[PDB]
Design a protein around this ligand. Structure first.
Ligand SMILES: Nc1ncnc2c1ncn2[C@@H]1O[C@H](COP(=O)(O)OP(=O)(O)O)[C@@H](O)[C@H]1O
Lengths: 93, 370, 49
């Protein structure tokens, strides 16, 4: 395969991906092998296109939060003045 | 600038207190006032009419007990001042009040009006230099010295579960139930009239409470354990009288997990507890599996934590090792944790001067709440 | 401050679980920076022509 997508209106977008596979089957005639080969590639492409959609789904939850989380340890807010002072209990355990 | 503060571990049933840096609360006395039923025309007997402690427990007969505090919400605030004045007794303090820092206790899920009126007392009737109170579960954690934990208190009629991650609670995953041993003894009184017995007097009911605390435990399979016959090893009253038992020794404490059987749209400590746990992080539950903080003295039961382990197996996760911390000074844990906090130079940042109250007061309460 | 009886009482006050109050008392003393200022500007103070 070969993928090369690019967007550049205020943000870089360089989408590059592929998939390379190989199978084998005995030759029958022209029609059988035609629909056979094209059907295999066809489903593999549609399949991987769906996989890419799910990859986008894996981005939102894993990738982002795998790098940039969305919520705190309490998962709700951040009191900056509480960071400025109080020493929350950094000597208990 | 301050003096030695005093941690006042307010148990819902028995209040406790003691100076900073100590290991045992200096005072341990309950929360109720008695006033005599009978009066006299005779000249030469006692006086007072307001007693708390050995005086009250001494002559329980006429002193009609009345608990002023209900779920923290006390209604005899004036009498609480008198109670704290009793904390300033000759046998109790002989110290001053408007010249020393202090420490009391505070449970969550409460109206602010309580704290407001509290500040009014300690900073209107008193002139306490600096004073700040916070959440009790952190004090228990101080006693543990363990970052994360699932604290579950056990008052007289008050219970609440709090998860804390390194000194950070989960406001969206903290729950509370308005009952403990209070209605358990009331329910035992129900059992008493179920088999014909009334203990309607206040002191009489507290005697029933002592009986509960003296002989009660936890069963394994309640409906299956009901199939047997309780032999009822009769205890004998201080008055010298037969005391049967019934299922009370095991059935009555499990009322906590049957609020519908008592008439309350609730589910169970462990139930709503694990639900809030489910509302927590996917990862921190792993930590809390070993971080199970037991607190409150109402927890004294045979196989208490063991039946709790059974409850854990009821609410079993997807096969992950769990561990419970069951110390022996669970009531004292909060007092000692406050003593730890009271033994810190970090209270400078953790306090509020009285001058701050003079400046704002209510605004200092709202803004500098925690 | 160097009087041994008062220092004796200070040590016992530390021993009486009030370590924070006793330590805070001596941290209140700015005698360290005071004496360093004494000897800092002392050659500028004494032997001034
Ligand atoms: N043997 C016992 N079994 C069960 N509970 C007990 C026993 N002895 C004492 N208690 C309980 O100890 C508890 C202390 O409660 P309290 O001081 O109100 O706790 P808290 O500090 O959580 O408010 C009381 O609720 C009382 O019922």
């Amino acid at each position: 395969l070969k993928i090369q997508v690019h967007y550049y209106e205020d943000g870089n977008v360089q989408l590059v991906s592929h998939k390379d596979v190989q199978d084998s089957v005995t030759v029958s005639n022209e029609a059988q092998t035609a629909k056979e080969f094209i059907k295999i590639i066809e489903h593999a492409e549609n399949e991987y296109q769906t996989a890419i959609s799910e990859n986008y789904q894996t981005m939102s939850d894993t990738t982002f939060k795998a790098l940039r989380r969305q919520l705190p340890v309490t998962r709700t807010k951040i009191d900056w003045n509480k960071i400025l002072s109080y020493k929350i209990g950094k000597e208990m355990q | 600038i301050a003096n030695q503060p005093v941690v006042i571990d307010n148990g819902s049933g028995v209040i406790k207190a003691g100076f900073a840096g100590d290991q045992i609360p200096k005072y341990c006395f309950p929360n109720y006032v008695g006033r005599p039923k009978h009066v006299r025309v005779m000249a030469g007997a006692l006086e007072g009419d307001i007693f708390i402690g050995p005086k009250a427990e001494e002559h329980r007969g006429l002193l009609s007990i009345r608990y002023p505090m209900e779920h923290g919400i006390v209604k005899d605030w004036n009498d609480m001042e008198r109670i704290w004045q009793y904390v300033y007794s000759k046998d109790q303090l002989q110290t001053f009040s408007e010249e020393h820092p202090v420490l009391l206790t505070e449970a969550p899920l409460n109206p602010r009006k309580n704290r407001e009126r509290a500040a009014e007392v300690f900073f209107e009737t008193f002139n306490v230099p600096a004073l700040f109170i916070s959440m009790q579960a952190v004090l228990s954690l101080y006693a543990t010295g363990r970052t994360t934990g699932v604290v579950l208190d056990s008052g007289d009629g008050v219970t609440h579960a709090v998860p804390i991650y390194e000194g950070f609670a989960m406001p969206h995953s903290i729950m509370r139930i308005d009952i403990a041993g209070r209605d358990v003894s009331r329910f035992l009184r129900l059992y008493l009239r179920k088999e014909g017995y009334d203990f309607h007097s206040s002191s009489e009911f507290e005697i029933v409470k002592a009986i509960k605390e003296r002989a009660c435990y936890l069963s394994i399979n309640p409906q299956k354990d009901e199939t047997l016959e309780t032999e009822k090893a009769q205890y004998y009253l201080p008055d010298g009288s037969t005391i049967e038992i019934g299922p009370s020794r095991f059935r009555a404490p499990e009322l906590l997990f049957r609020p519908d059987l008592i008439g309350e749209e609730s589910e169970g400590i462990h139930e709503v507890l694990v639900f809030a746990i489910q509302k927590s992080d996917m990862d921190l539950r792993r930590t809390l599996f070993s971080n199970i903080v037991l607190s409150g003295g109402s927890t004294l039961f045979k196989g208490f934590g063991d039946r709790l382990l059974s409850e854990v197996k009821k609410l079993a996760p997807k096969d992950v090792k769990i561990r419970i911390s069951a110390p022996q000074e669970r009531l004292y844990s909060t007092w000692i944790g406050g003593s730890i906090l009271a033994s810190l130079d970090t209270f400078k940042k953790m306090w509020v001067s009285k001058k701050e109250y003079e400046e704002d007061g209510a605004r200092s309460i709202h803004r500098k709440t925690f | 401050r160097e009087s041994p009886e008062v220092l004796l009482t200070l040590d016992i006050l530390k021993h009486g679980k009030r370590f924070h109050a006793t330590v805070s008392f001596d941290t209140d003393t700015g005698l360290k920076q005071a004496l360093e200022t004494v000897n800092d500007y002392n050659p500028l103070m004494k032997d001034f022509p």
